[PDB]
Each structure stands twice: as structure tokens, then as C-alpha cells.
Write a protein that binds this ligand. Structure first.
Ligand SMILES: [Mg+2]
Length: 701
């Protein structure tokens, strides 16, 4: 074959070559020492990795049985089987060497598929974004009569955008008197910002909110402000299209938006072989070396301090990289017998190696010397400790200081939720955040209690007792662990990519809940969500929550079982079509085109961002309804065949209809539902990877 032998490993040549020719040069790490290290790490930790997976199956088998055969009894049971462990002693995390974007700044956290270079670059550059563009291009500014979007600039709509932003400025950086709506000009005098009004001139209520400016102080090209640690930059140009119409010549209002971004190797991308992993690793490498070009990465921004000195602000989002979890293997590397090597282990080694470049001036990501890795789908403290040991072994192989590789803990599996304190403690010196990945968490909620009975509709999950308890519990544990000022307390994604007016009105609940960050689907969403952090003083919210215990173990364990006679025929029908539509729209692009993240309109025609987690939920819900007689196999088939044609319509695309059984993608969709109950913890990768590889094979012959 086309593999390279290194000890007990046989590395796909493309991966081998990529590492030696692109990743290693510049790290001082000799190839022979690196590969020997890979071999050693895989050999040493694989047994423990498998053991952990066996533990998951064992626990789930006991739970399935318990249901097939009272909160006090259930809780007692979970304790006996080691599912629910004792609460560890109180403690404070000790993670050091973390950048300000994580320890101090509260703001949006963007996620992007790392296999898409364009997206990745746009996301990295999302650190700064036009509020005008975000307001004008979305429904935040309703397209009422006269204010709708046309092929050319609508002056009326533009005026609404201007007023919207002027109000934002008034609410964020208050003037001593008057409002920005009446400003006529901006000047810097005695290191002070002076806003000219018609009747008089005024300074800032809090002069300290003035952070800088560009151009001559006597007539700045831009004025930099700061609120709750986030920058706001007013651009000034009386000659610009918008400026010519503004009272103070204001051209735009730029907001520091995506403070941090997660370059994702997991749920938003489809990488089933060495070739796919390499495309991802190379983009990750380009990001860290700063030379990725599809467009390029922006340079840092230069300003003059109010006092006179020159300073620079990062023009890029501080990058995290989300490795895959402990489950999957990938043939990018196989042993002598041909057994695939655990993908998570490889990601730690490769993304870690690559991350070293982001620790040096491009020919910088982290100035404090840390590598930020999000580790998803972990189940319990032992799996967290396993990840920490993996990182410890990789640092050794890479010759990096111990604890360089920090971990962003996803709280997205039930066994981690109910043992969250312990999970944090296991990574007390490496954790940089905990985040409530509500989608995966909901998927795990359904699978864990699969045998308990029919679950409530998917949409109903967002407001169930278990998830609300889960959200507050995550915050409580993080704050109790001393996260405020040391690590991020984050919350989930807003998947309705086009409903920005709704996101702006409701996503404010997250920072209000003490979350120093939350996930956004795009640069536009990051800029709009940034608004929330200007309205909410997260640092103050967290201080006020410190010490509070708002969720009981009972609330966390409250299974989302549906009540008797809960739905009507039309309601069950809608739920099935909606879930099938979501599954088919996502899967067809996954299997046929290798796209792990797509915008798929639901039964209500609302554009929803689909990823493996949204898929895990839809497939698990239907698997659960089919499992308990709520719907028949005919209902599932009919929905799939009814929605399939619509998906073909919405879309190098290969139609699934009319001959659905000839479509590998259609078959995958059907398999995910019908075999959903048998998938490990309801994970979609096993099926998705197999079907995607099958497609590639067929396409090759
Ligand atoms: Mg997830």
C-alpha cells in the first residue's frame, strides 16, 4: 500500500509527507523523534482509550436494563453503577499562561469548519466587523415599507441602521450630556474625547471609555472606544457613501466581535480518511503560520492612545482548535493488523504540533504560550483525566512545557453534566473553559434514557427542566471553581442563521446567565451578539452569582419523557417530516460532497445550521419514537420519501429521488434513524464515516 512504517504504525503517505514537509519545519522537532513519539503515544494510551469506551457501553447497558425491568431509586441506582460519582472537595482552578481573550474578555465565540479555508479565514478575521453591514444586511432592521433591501443602497434603511447604532453608542458609551444622535464632529483634546453637539460640546460620562483614535487628533479618521472590555470603533469620513449622509460624517461603527474562534475538526466537517484530515491540518497550519490564503488574514490594527503613544490591537480572533472526541478511529493510520488508530489521539499529536507555529511570530496566536484545544463528547472525570494525560504525553513528544496544551471542556454529555465539578477538577490546571454544548447534550439525553419511554418533541427539549438545570449548573460549577477572571463559562450556538432579529432579542439571556461567551454561526452573528456584552456586564453578573447553587441533582436527572396523550396526529406528522427534512438535508451533503455543515430549511422554511449534533438529536428522537410505538417504520419511510424530493430541489449534487435505494446518502439517512438505537451513545460518526467512504469508493470505480 501507500503507507509509511514507523514502529507498529503504517501512516498514510499523504499524512506522512504533510507532517515532514509542512508541519515539522520550523519547530526544531526532528521527524524521527516525532514519529517515534507518535508510535509510543498511540501504543501507550490506546488501551486506556478503549477501556473508557467499554465503560460507556457497560453503563448504558445497565441503564437500558434498569428501564426495561422514583427519583430516589433511580439516583441510588446511578450511584451504585458508578455513573453518578461523589462530589469532590471545593477547589479553585490553577490554569496559568492564558491569554486575555479567555481569562478576562467576555464576548462572542465563533465556530468554523476547518476544512473550508475561506470560511476559516473570514472567521479568524471576524475579530472586527461592521455593525452597519450586520444591521443593514439582516432582519435586525425590519424590511418594513420603504426600508427594504434592493439591488442598490436604500437611504431610508441606511438611516435606520445609523439611528440604531447611535442608540447603541448612547447606551454603551454615554456622553456627559446629549446623545451621539446629535453629534456633529469628533476631536481629541488634552487626551480627551470631545463630541461636538449643536448647542455645545461634551465629553464622555466616563472619560475612561475613550481608548484611542486614528489620524490627526484635530480631526481623527476614527475614534476608538471601549466598554466592558470590548472595543467599538467609529469610522469618520464625510465623503463616504454613508458618511456624506451622516450628521458627524460617521461612515461606520466597527465592533470587536469574534474575540475567539474555534477552528473545528469535529462536528462541522467531514473527514473520513488521511486525505480529508490533511486538508484540515494544512488549513490549521496556515492559520497558525499566518500564511493561509484562499483572501488572507488581516494584520493587527494600529491606534494612537488618548495620551499620545502608539499601540496595536489584534486584528484576528484568538484561535482554539476543536479536536474530535475519544470515540472514532481513522485509517489515516493503521497498525500492522490494519486496525485504525484512534482519531482523538492523532488530533492531539497533529493539531498540537501545528499549533506550535501559532506560538511564534509569523514569517501570533497566543502570546502567553498556550495551545487551546476543545475536547468534545467526553463522558465523566476519567475521560477528562485521560485527555489531560494524552496532552501531557504529546507535550513530552513535542518538547513543549507541561500544561501548554489547555483544554476547552465541552459539557455536552449527561455523565459529564452530573459529575461536572469532578471533570473540571481532573483538568484543574489545564481548563480554559466549560461550555454547554446543548445540541450534543440533548442527543445524549435521548439516548441515555432511550428505554424509559417516548420523549417530548425536539423543539420542546430547549425548555425542558433538565436543560434549564443543566445550563445553570454549568455556570454554578465554573464560578464555584473560580472561573471568573481565569477561564470562560460558555453557552451554545444559535442555529437559525438568518433570524438575526430574533437572536439579538433573545440570545442576550446567555450573558445575563453569567456566560462570558457563547457560540455564533457566522461573523455577522458575532458582531450582532457582541451587542449583548455591551448591554450586560458579565463580570458583574458572575460576581452576583458566585456561591449560588441553583440546580439540584434531581432537576438535572429529570428525563424529558412525554406525558400521556401529549400530541395530536398532525403534530406527530410535523415532528417526523421536520426531523427527516433536517436529517436528509444534512446527510446528503455530508455523504455525497463531504460537507459537514450546511444550512437546511426546516418544515417551516427557516434556515437551520445542521451539524452532527443536530443530526444526533433528530435521528435519536425518531429512533426513540419508533422504539416506543409512537410512529411506525412506514411513517419514517414515507417522511423520508416525502422530504427527499424537496431536499433535491433545494440543491455536483446527486438527486436522491426517485430511486432512493440507489442513493448512498439516502441509505445513510435511513440507517441513522433505523439503527439509531444501536449506535454508541447515539453517535452519528460510525454511520456517516462508513457511508461517506462507501460513496468515495463507488465514485472511484
Ligand atoms: Mg457538540
Amino acid at each position: 500500500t501507500d503507507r509509511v512504517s514507523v514502529g507498529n504504525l503504517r501512516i498514510a503517505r499523504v499524512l506522512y509527507d504533510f507532517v515532514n514537509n509542512e508541519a515539522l519545519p520550523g519547530t526544531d522537532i526532528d521527524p524521527d523523534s516525532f514519529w517515534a513519539g507518535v508510535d509510543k503515544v498511540v501504543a501507550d494510551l490506546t488501551p486506556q482509550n478503549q477501556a473508557l469506551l467499554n465503560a460507556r457501553d457497560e453503563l448504558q447497558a445497565q441503564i437500558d436494563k434498569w428501564h426495561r425491568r422514583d427519583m430516589d431509586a433511580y439516583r441510588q441506582f446511578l450511584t451504585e453503577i458508578g455513573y453518578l460519582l461523589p462530589e469532590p472537595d471545593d477547589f479553585t482552578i490553577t490554569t496559568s499562561g492564558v491569554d486575555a481573550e479567555i481569562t478576562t474578555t467576555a464576548g462572542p465565540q465563533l465556530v468554523v469548519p476547518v476544512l473550508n479555508a475561506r470560511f476559516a479565514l473570514n472567521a479568524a478575521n471576524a475579530r472586527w466587523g461592521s455593525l452597519y453591514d450586520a444591521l443593514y444586511g439582516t432582519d435586525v432592521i425590519p424590511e418594513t415599507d420603504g426600508a427594504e433591501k434592493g439591488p442598490t443602497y436604500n437611504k431610508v434603511r441606511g438611516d435606520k441602521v445609523i439611528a440604531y447604532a447611535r442608540k447603541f453608542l448612547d447606551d454603551s458609551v454615554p456622553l456627559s450630556s446629549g446623545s451621539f444622535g446629535d453629534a456633529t464632529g469628533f476631536t481629541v483634546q488634552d487626551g480627551q474625547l470631545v463630541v461636538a453637539l449643536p448647542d455645545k460640546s461634551t465629553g464622555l460620562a466616563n472619560p475612561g471609555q475613550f481608548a484611542g483614535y486614528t489620524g490627526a487628533a484635530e480631526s481623527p479618521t476614527s475614534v476608538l472606544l471601549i466598554n466592558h472590555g470590548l472595543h467599538i470603533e467609529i469610522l469618520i469620513d464625510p465623503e463616504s457613501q454613508v458618511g456624506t449622509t451622516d450628521r458627524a460624517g460617521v461612515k461606520d461603527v466597527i465592533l470587536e466581535s469574534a474575540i475567539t474562534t474555534i477552528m473545528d475538526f469535529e462536528d462541522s466537517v467531514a473527514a473520513v480518511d488521511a486525505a480529508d484530515k490533511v486538508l484540515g491540518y494544512r488549513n490549521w497550519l496556515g492559520l497558525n503560520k499566518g500564511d493561509l490564503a484562499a483572501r488572507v488574514l488581516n494584520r493587527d490594527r494600529n491606534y494612537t492612545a488618548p495620551g499620545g503613544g502608539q499601540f496595536t490591537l489584534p486584528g484576528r480572533s484568538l484561535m482554539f482548535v476543536r479536536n474530535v472526541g475519544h470515540l472514532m478511529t481513522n485509517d489515516a493510520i493503521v497498525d500492522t493488523d490494519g486496525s485504525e488508530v484512534f482519531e482523538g489521539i492523532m488530533d492531539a499529536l497533529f493539531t498540537g504540533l501545528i499549533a506550535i507555529h501559532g506560538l511564534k511570530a509569523s514569517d501570533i496566536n497566543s502570546r502567553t504560550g498556550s495551545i487551546y484545544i476543545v475536547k468534545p463528547k467526553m463522558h465523566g472525570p476519567a475521560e477528562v483525566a485521560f485527555t489531560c494525560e494524552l496532552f501531557s504525553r504529546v507535550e513530552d513528544v513535542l518538547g513543549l512545557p507541561q500544561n501548554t496544551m489547555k483544554i476547552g471542556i465541552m459539557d455536552e454529555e449527561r455523565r459529564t453534566t452530573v459529575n461536572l465539578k469532578a471533570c473540571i477538577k481532573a483538568a484543574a490546571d489545564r481548563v480554559v473553559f466549560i461550555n454547554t454544548g446543548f445540541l450534543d447534550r440533548t442527543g445524549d439525553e435521548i439516548h441515555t434514557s432511550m428505554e424509559a419511554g417516548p420523549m417530548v418533541r425536539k423543539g420542546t427539549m430547549k425548555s425542558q427542566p433538565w436543560i434549564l438545570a443543566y445550563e445553570d449548573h454549568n455556570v454554578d460549577a465554573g464560578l464555584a471553581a473560580g472561573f471568573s477572571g481565569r477561564a470562560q463559562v460558555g453557552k451554545g450556538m444559535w442555529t437559525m442563521t438568518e433570524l438575526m432579529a430574533d437572536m439579538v432579542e433573545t440570545k442576550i439571556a446567555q450573558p445575563r446567565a453569567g456566560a462570558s461567551t457563547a457560540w455564533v454561526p457566522s461573523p455577522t452573528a458575532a458582531t450582532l451578539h457582541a451587542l449583548h456584552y455591551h448591554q450586560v456586564d458579565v463580570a458583574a453578573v458572575q460576581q452576583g452569582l458566585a456561591g449560588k447553587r441553583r440546580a439540584t441533582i434531581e432537576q438535572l436527572l429529570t428525563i424529558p419523557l412525554a406525558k400521556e396523550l401529549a400530541w395530536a396526529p398532525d403534530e406527530i406528522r410535523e415532528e417526523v417530516d421536520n426531523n427527516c427534512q433536517s436529517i436528509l438535508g444534512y446527510v446528503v451533503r455530508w455523504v455525497d460532497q463531504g460537507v459537514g455543515c450546511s444550512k437546511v430549511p426546516d418544515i417551516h422554511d427557516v434556515a437551520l445550521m445542521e451539524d452532527r449534533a443536530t443530526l444526533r438529536i433528530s435521528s435519536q428522537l425518531l429512533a426513540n419514537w419508533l422504539r416506543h410505538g409512537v410512529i411506525t417504520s412506514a411513517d419514517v419511510r414515507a417522511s423520508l420519501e416525502r422530504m427527499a424530493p424537496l431536499v433535491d430541489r433545494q440543491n455536483a449534487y446527486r438527486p436522491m429521488a426517485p430511486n432512493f435505494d440507489d442513493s448512498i446518502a439516502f441509505l445513510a439517512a435511513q440507517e441513522l434513524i433505523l439503527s439509531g438505537a444501536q449506535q454508541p451513545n447515539g453517535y452519528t460518526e460510525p454511520i456517516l464515516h462508513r457511508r461517506r467512504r462507501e460513496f468515495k469508493a463507488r465514485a472511484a470505480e
